[PDB]
Amino acid sequence: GSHMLQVRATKDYCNNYDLTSLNVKAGDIITVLEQHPDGRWKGCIHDNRTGNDRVGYFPSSLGEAIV
């Protein structure tokens, strides 16, 4: 599950005011890649509602990778 992967994450992940985080809204799609320069990767959110597209950093395998 490397070289770009899309993950399905079920959680409500959105904190702080202004921040870069995977805005997971309990059953949402995340389009991520495998960077791992220390342990965290960067990924984008694929929103299935309006188009909430934001980038966030996550500590490796966050959602269920469907590639």
Swiss-Prot record:
Signal peptide (from-to): none
Annotated SH3 domain residues: 5-67
Superkingdom of origin: Eukaryota
Localization of this protein: Cytoplasm
Subunit structure: Binds the CaM kinase domain of CASK. Forms a ternary complex with CASK and LIN7A, LIN7B or LIN7C. Competes with APBA1 that forms a similar complex with CASK and LIN7 proteins. The tripartite complex CASKIN1/CASK/LIN7(A/B/C) binds the cytoplasmic tail of NRXN1. Polymerizes, via the tandem SAM domains, to form long, 8 nM wide fibers, upon which other proteins can assemble.
Function of the molecule: May link the scaffolding protein CASK to downstream intracellular effectors.
Protein name, entry field: Caskin-1
Originating species: Homo sapiens
Residue range from the parent sequence: 284 to 346 of 1431
